[PDB]
Amino acid sequence: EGLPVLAPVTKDTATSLYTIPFHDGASLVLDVAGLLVWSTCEGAEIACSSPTCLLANAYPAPGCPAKPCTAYPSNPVTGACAAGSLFHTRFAANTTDGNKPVSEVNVRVLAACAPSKLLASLPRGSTGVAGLAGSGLALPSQVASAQKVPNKFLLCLPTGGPGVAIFGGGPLPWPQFTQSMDYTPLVAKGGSPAHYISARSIKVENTRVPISERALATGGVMLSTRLPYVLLRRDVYRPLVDAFTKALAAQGAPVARAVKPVAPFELCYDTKTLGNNPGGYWVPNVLLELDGGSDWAMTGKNSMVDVKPGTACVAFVEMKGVDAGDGSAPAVILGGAQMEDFVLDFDMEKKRLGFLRLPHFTGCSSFNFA
Amino acid sequence: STDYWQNWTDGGGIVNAVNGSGGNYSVNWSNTGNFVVGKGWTTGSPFRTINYNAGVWAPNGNGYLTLYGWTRSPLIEYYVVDSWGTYRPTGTYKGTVKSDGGTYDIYTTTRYNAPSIDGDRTTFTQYWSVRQSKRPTGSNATITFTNHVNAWKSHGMNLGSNWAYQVMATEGYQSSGSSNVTVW
């Protein structure tokens, strides 16, 4: 039919990136801010004057500049990019009713070839990147027009086990829970595919982090799957971290011990001095108060990264190379661990992000084929 | 009588939990994300008979009225869900057991790199006995936990040898509600 398309999502342990099967027991890296689908190939036509081509190069990625279509795939980890051209390939997955995988499907899609040197630092078995940011050549837009479904995708990233990617709308999964999904606008930024939302305020425990009037801009929160942790601009980092540490120090909890800072985190602890509760490590809750009147909760499972056995570090890292309130840079880039066990509905047609933190006793990996 | 108190929220909404006298607790909550409140024992036991009286059970949305707890060796989380809100939790069906005037279905579910009593990133199976229809509340009610243990054992679901907390809880999510529960 024109049915939504489901792929399971793997959190790769060594990299903390998330992938989906693509074809031939090869996988792509989900990159929510990415504009292209790209991979390596074996040894497809379209003119570089064509709208398709021009749209693919309409927002040249950092390192890159700009007759067959030459596109410019980039690696989301390293920032390396490279020339390559477009080729028809197949994205093999299953259709879905919303609850489970129904039938196999190969979706005709356009990807750019990339040289193998571009796989650097991506997960073993990965041949490339599923760009999800709203566009022309991103995976959700191509699945949409290839399968005649909404230009809309759904992610439920796992902490472990297979999570969920659904492209094309349809009923929400976990209908027992997602009837109460909250919604926040996707804010348009200039020259930029990406996904932005707005938060009026951040709370640590029950109390607001003293951050301006409007530094949590309109669209000052970006989502990304490139890092596990959260990046904060200067004007948000110090105050959020300070509030977090004072609230940490007020816990009947064990007295936390600070240990040897592991990079890039400049705040780590010994896990035998962190307590454990249903939220994960017993550290203060941090809530983003989003447009829409609903909060995005973070608990220990989101706010702390288990770096090595015995140590866990606070998953807020400062942006380097950056002024306080530099409008161009987002105030908060929220990472993959801050989206795990959220059902995220990225509705590009209605300019909104549905979000719902699933209950503590389940997770994204509980989706499936009884 | 009880020696363990649990009061966790993920920070969403308003969760007013009262650690009352003896085994009594109440929770009034609204506009939540997710919370769990209860009383029971620091050390669970497969032979415990839980007695409780839920004088109020008034969920508006998702909420669970459940005995639940943990073992280590191995790490298992378990649930005996006597009532709920809008949705009845399920999982992989394993069997059914009659106990304390009710019929429960037995389910397993699995959690990967998930929170637990062992850490923030852990792997375990959960065992569930979930009643077929909501247990009436307002009167003294018994959970003969051995009946559940034995029925789980008969279906290849073995608990760990060592028993951590075991609480009669109120769990609420994306919801509003009141609970008033007395455990002994």
TrEMBL record, chain A:
Q: Where in the numbering of this chain does the Peptidase A1 domain appear?
A: 13-356
Q: Which Pfam families match?
A: TAXi_C, TAXi_N
Kindly list the cysteine pairs connected by disulfide bridges: C41-C113, C53-C69, C64-C81, C156-C364, C268-C313
GO BP, one example? xylan catabolic process
**Entry annotated with the keyword Signal:** yes
One GO MF term on file is: aspartic-type endopeptidase activity
Q: Which PANTHER family match?
A: ASPARTYL PROTEASE-RELATED, XYLANASE INHIBITOR
Give the family from UniProt: Belongs to the peptidase A1 family.
Q: What is this protein called?
A: Xylanase inhibitor
> What organism is listed for this UniProt entry?
Triticum aestivum
